From a paper:
GPR34 is a recently identified G-protein coupled receptor, which has an immunomodulatory role and recognizes lysophosphatidylserine (LysoPS) as a putative ligand. The ligand-binding pocket of GPR34 extends from the centre of ECL2 to the middle of TM4–5, forming an ~25-Å cleft that is laterally open toward the membrane.
S3E-LysoPS is an analogue of sn-3-type 18:1 LysoPS, with an ethoxy group at the sn-1 position. Local refinement with the mask of the receptor improved local resolution of the extracellular half of the receptor, and the resulting cryo-EM maps allowed modelling of the entire complexes, including agonists. S3E-LysoPS fits into this cleft, oblique to the receptor. The head group of S3E-LysoPS fits into the pocket, with a U-shaped conformation. The acyl chain of S3E-LysoPS is bent at the cis-9 double bond and fits along the L-shaped pocket. Moreover, R2866.55A mutation abolishes agonist response, whereas alanine mutations of R208ECL2, N3097.35, and E3107.36 reduced potency by ~10–30-fold.
Numbering used by the authors: 45 to 342
């Protein structure tokens, strides 16, 4: 290996992940309470948000093991089993979050731009179907990768999450390439969905047929682009560098490349978990009723 100094990396990762842990924990607990407590009835969007809250709660649950490993001595005291379990559950949660984000955007685009009257709220059915399908497929992929790693591989060690070349497991390289291309497709769908939502609300505000509360359309138009840009800044960096990460991880290379690649990936993961901790606060603020509840309570 090439052991370059990483005390500053350890400190920044520990503090960032601890802040993300506390913020995402409080955000996701309050979000779960407001999705099961004060929402006796659920809509498709509320179902998808509840599942994003669950996925993110599991990501904040994954965080403390990462902070322990990074702060203790940058050494992994537990077995290779727990290493692979946490390292796989984290990515499982991230890509479940991203798929559910895409699904919310798609339903908002079918609800806002093209819906003329309503849908008679028959949407919770296929909402629960799609959420259960995606969760089961994600459990399938997570267990597949964890069993293909724990037994088929020959390499286990006493340190975790560190940079390891995937020449020992090319299946993981191809799995990550598949995941990156599908994330870019999902983000293309999100960008189409939210751009079209903003444009439709902008034109409707431009006509302004009915004078009363015609400005709420401006607020919603800004909110569409806000959530698109937050998702764009919190995810596109990581998945844009991941192509270079895979390309470097499956060829002969010097170590100096390896330190910069590893530390870039650490910062990008800090960003990704930052999104997973923001999203509940985003739903708290963007909803009129919840924002009024918070403002009158605070
Ligand atoms: C329609 C098909 C969609 C397919 C996915 C279904 C939903 C998603 C379900 C769960 C993802 C499971 C984890 C996948 C891991 C991909 C990323 C990756 O390569 O992580 C590797 C793990 C180690 O895994 C064993 C080889 O990395 P770590 O060692 O935990 O961290 C190393 C490094 N810090 C890094 O993360 O690059």
């Amino acid at each position: 290996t090439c052991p370059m100094d990483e005390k500053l990396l350890s400190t920044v990762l520990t503090t960032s992940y601890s802040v993300i842990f506390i913020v995402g924990l409080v955000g996701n607990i309050i979000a779960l309470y407001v999705f099961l407590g004060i929402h006796r009835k659920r809509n498709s969007i509320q179902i998808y948000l509840l599942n994003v809250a669950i996925a993110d709660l599991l990501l904040i649950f994954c965080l403390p093991f990462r902070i322990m490993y990074h702060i203790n001595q940058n050494k992994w005291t537990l077995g290779v089993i727990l290493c692979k379990v946490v390292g796989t559950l984290f990515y499982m949660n991230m890509y479940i979050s991203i798929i559910l984000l895409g699904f919310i955007s798609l339903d908002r685009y079918i609800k806002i731009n093209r819906s003329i009257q309503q849908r008679k709220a028959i949407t919770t059915k296929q909402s629960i179907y799609v959420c259960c399908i995606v969760w089961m497929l994600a459990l399938g992929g997570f267990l597949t990768m964890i069993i293909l790693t724990l037994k088929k591989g020959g390499h286990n060690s006493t340190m975790c999450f560190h940079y390891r070349d995937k020449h020992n497991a090319k299946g993981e390289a191809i799995f990550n390439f598949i995941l990156v291309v599908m994330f870019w497709l999902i983000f293309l769908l999100i960008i189409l969905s939210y751009i079209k939502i903003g444009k439709n609300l902008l034109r409707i505000s431009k006509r302004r047929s009915k004078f009363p509360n015609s400005g709420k359309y401006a607020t919603t138009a800004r909110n569409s682009f806000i959530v698109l840009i937050i998702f764009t800044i919190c995810f596109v960096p990581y998945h844009a560098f991941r192509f270079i990460y895979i390309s470097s991880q499956l060829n002969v290379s010097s170590c100096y490349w390896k330190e910069i690649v590893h530390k870039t990936n650490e910062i990008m993961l800090v960003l990704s978990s930052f999104n997973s901790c923001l999203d509940p606060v985003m739903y708290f603020l963007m909803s009129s009723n919840i924002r009024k509840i918070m403002c009158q309570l605070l």
